[PDB]
Amino acid sequence: ATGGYVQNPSGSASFTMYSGCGSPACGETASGYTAAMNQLSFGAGPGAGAGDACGRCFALTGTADPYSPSYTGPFHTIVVKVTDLCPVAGNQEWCGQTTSNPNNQHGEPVHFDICEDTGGAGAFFPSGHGALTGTYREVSCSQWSGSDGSPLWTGACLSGESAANWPSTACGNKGTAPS
């Protein structure tokens, strides 16, 4: 996509959880399940505002535990709305994908950090299994439950929630992908 960001509607991803998404990079929260996406797919660097992932909805499916290969389940599928950025500089292990090294250390090209604040992390991760790998696919936000918060600053954007799936432009990417 423009800027060199990697924005495919479906593929492989890794998954973790985080707490604290009340001031997210898209500038607007949501009450349903939400996630941060690694910088190279989010479409903006830290402090740059909303990237083109903002507001888009994705079905996330766990398929493996990277710390226990023998674990065969149970896993879950949830639908999240992306509201936030998982930056290279703050989380290299999972979100360090760059144009020069497009996979994270766990071998995945995309990462979703699922927010605990609104329950998505508990819906997705079995207790005792807080990091997973699996798949993602962009879906209609009709499959997502919840409602959006109020914009935190001028430029806040979740307009990906009504856009056609990637490849396409809703909020738009900002700047250039991390190198």
Numbering used by the authors: 5 to 183
Sentences from the paper on this structure:
Here we describe the first crystal structure of a beta‐1,4‐endoglucanase from a brown‐rot fungus, Gloeophyllum trabeum GtCel45A, which belongs to subfamily C of glycoside hydrolase family 45 (GH45). The enzyme consists of a single catalytic module folded into a six‐stranded double‐psi beta‐barrel domain surrounded by long loops. GtCel45A is very similar in sequence (82% identity) and structure to PcCel45A from the white‐rot fungus Phanerochaete chrysosporium.
GtCel45A is ~ 18 kDa in size and the crystal structure contains 179 amino acids. The structure is refined at 1.30 Å resolution and R free 0.18. Surprisingly though, initial hydrolysis of barley beta‐glucan was almost twice as fast in GtCel45A as compared to PcCel45A.
